[PDB]
Design a protein around this ligand. Structure first.
Ligand SMILES: Nc1ncnc2c1ncn2[C@@H]1O[C@H](COP(=O)(O)OP(=O)(O)NP(=O)(O)O)[C@@H](O)[C@H]1O
Ligand SMILES: Nc1ncnc2c1ncn2[C@@H]1O[C@H](COP(=O)(O)OP(=O)(O)NP(=O)(O)O)[C@@H](O)[C@H]1O
Lengths: 313, 317
């Protein structure tokens, strides 16, 4: 049982990706090899991979995609990439073509969960509450059936790259234009406030289990934003906490997710809304997902072992 | 401009893929090379590819994936594969990594349109009419909110599809279906129904084609003639009153735009009781110069080479 980890990626979460590879590599209960995708798309195998894993960022790589890697040597591949070319289904399909079992969501589920429009349409349809939104295709005349303020962000592009809060219905044109830079389609969502953020993790294939529920609170700026808190158990009557968990498990089911998902929720005026499912969350031993499950009773090592095994069932 | 055509595939539509590549290869108005995926999953390049085409069926290939192809030599990849590793978005996903512009639907649209459950959900939420249905996942009690009869097909695989007359039979159709896809759909058996087809062309905002109709003729023994095989009839255009033709076409365009499909699509509908029901969207249909999609567009005034030309050109958006 040998495992292959692919960290890095061409997305803005590159550094965090390598940072996660560090945690996994250290506490993973399996002989594990590393492979790195440099910011320039080139791959780094062998020791160059780890040398980069030690530098906290891999500006450039050696092998053009597809890399001359020895997929033969591995039973399971653990992708740790974010956003575009990470959890959008592209890498997953590559793996399907190579016939390699892999950790996490498959093609379809990664692509749906990555697109802010289609995933909302599926969840809405399935009874999961989502924020009132609208999709705006490039060249299509905007039509917001609700008043500002609101959020505009490209349909499917990880990290807040291209997002913006819009106050005046007039400035909506600037928002779209910006977002259009990273995607042909964009979403306009009714901005909530007051608003609390709740996080919950899921483990398992299709019918997974939910970890306890946690709340993300931000501390004052000090200009740098303040340290985000990870309150858990989150301060919600047992009622809403359960509701949040069953809602996540339900969304996890209809979308056919596999392995894991960091499900984010918005709590505004007593109402819940599922913001998004992250098929590949941050994996440092001190990241939101592993910390959530540790609280649920699953050690970092055990969590990784269960994930890798799941890639085979 | 240089185009790379990829046909064959490990799926059951392997043979039909090659015939499509044949038509495409004979009329495409651009220099085009052929790459073939044999049934064993190994690729055939250059001459071997073209030779596999001649025999119509490539049992074995020479190169394990990924193939040693000079992608750089091409401006657009036109993938002609049906089903698994064809419309599911894996090859499309592989092409995104290669950064090559390709013909047809992207990863999401391809994956989504390929799923008989997720696609209906998105279309329903969009107000597009679909046949009542419910999804059932292996090892989970079925909760069919509607009375029989009804069809049970696997969610992502035309095998395993059975017609159920009585509930006591559902467990059988399900078990039957779960031997292909971990997920299946139970649809309300609509009767009587007329099948309607319309082709869409363009990226997201397309141009519909004339509506066509499919009718089956059973095999029979003729007095003078003798045996006469079963037959599928493609009536272009469909014998419908303008209002229905109008609706079915706009309905096609509506669904095409919601799903964000690119390049092309053959949209199928069921007409029953005067109610139109969107059955499914095929992101990569047959391309024989006599397949429904190409014929539909000929009727619509777009010659074959022209249809091919526009498809390729759209790949570059
Ligand atoms: N409708 C909304 N109302 C209030 N706050 C919002 C809303 N939408 C987004 N936000 C805020 O913006 C933050 C990031 O939005 P988010 O969609 O999670 O970016 P993202 O994580 O990069 N999505 P993705 O690109 O698919 O991974 C959230 O944590 C919220 O604090
Ligand atoms: N709800 C229905 N009512 C009446 N007839 C149906 C219904 N569903 C399917 N059929 C018939 O069964 C045939 C095949 O079902 P169909 O779903 O079109 O196979 P498919 O297009 O290959 N999709 P798949 O089930 O994934 O293989 C259709 O051409 C119809 O004639």
């Amino acid at each position: 049982m040998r495992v292959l980890l692919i960290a890095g990626g061409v997305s803005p979460e590159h550094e965090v990706s390598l940072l996660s590879a560090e945690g996994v590599l250290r506490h993973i209960p399996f002989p594990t090899d590393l492979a790195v995708i440099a910011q320039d798309g080139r791959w780094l195998l062998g020791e160059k991979a780890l040398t980069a894993l030690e530098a906290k960022a891999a500006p450039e790589g050696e092998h053009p995609f597809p890399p001359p890697l020895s997929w033969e040597r591995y039973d399971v591949v653990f992708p740790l990439l974010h956003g575009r070319f990470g959890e959008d289904g592209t890498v997953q399909g590559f793996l399907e073509l190579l016939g390699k079992p892999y950790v996490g969501a498959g093609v379809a589920a990664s692509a749906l969960c990555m697109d802010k429009d289609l995933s909302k349409r599926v969840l809405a349809q399935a009874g999961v509450p989502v924020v009132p939104w609208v999709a705006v295709r490039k060249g299509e005349p905007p039509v917001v059936p609700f008043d500002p303020p609101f959020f505009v962000k490209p349909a499917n592009t990880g990290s807040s790259v291209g997002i913006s809060r819009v106050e005046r219905f007039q400035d909506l044109e600037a928002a779209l234009a910006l977002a259009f830079r990273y995607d042909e389609k964009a979403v306009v969502e009714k901005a909530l406030s007051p608003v609390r953020e709740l996080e919950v993790g899921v483990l398992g294939n299709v019918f997974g289990e939910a970890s306890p529920v946690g709340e993300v609170r931000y501390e004052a700026p000090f200009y740098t934003p303040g340290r985000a808190e990870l309150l858990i158990p989150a301060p919600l009557d047992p009622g809403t906490q359960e509701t949040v968990q069953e809602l996540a498990l339900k969304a996890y089911k209809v979308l056919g997710v596999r392995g894991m998902a960091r499900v984010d929720f918005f709590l505004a005026e007593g109402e819940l809304y599922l913001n998004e499912l992250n098929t590949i969350p941050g994996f440092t031993p001190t990241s939101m997902y592993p910390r959530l499950f540790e609280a649920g009773g699953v050690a970092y090592p055990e969590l990784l072992r269960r994930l890798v095994e799941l890639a085979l069932t």
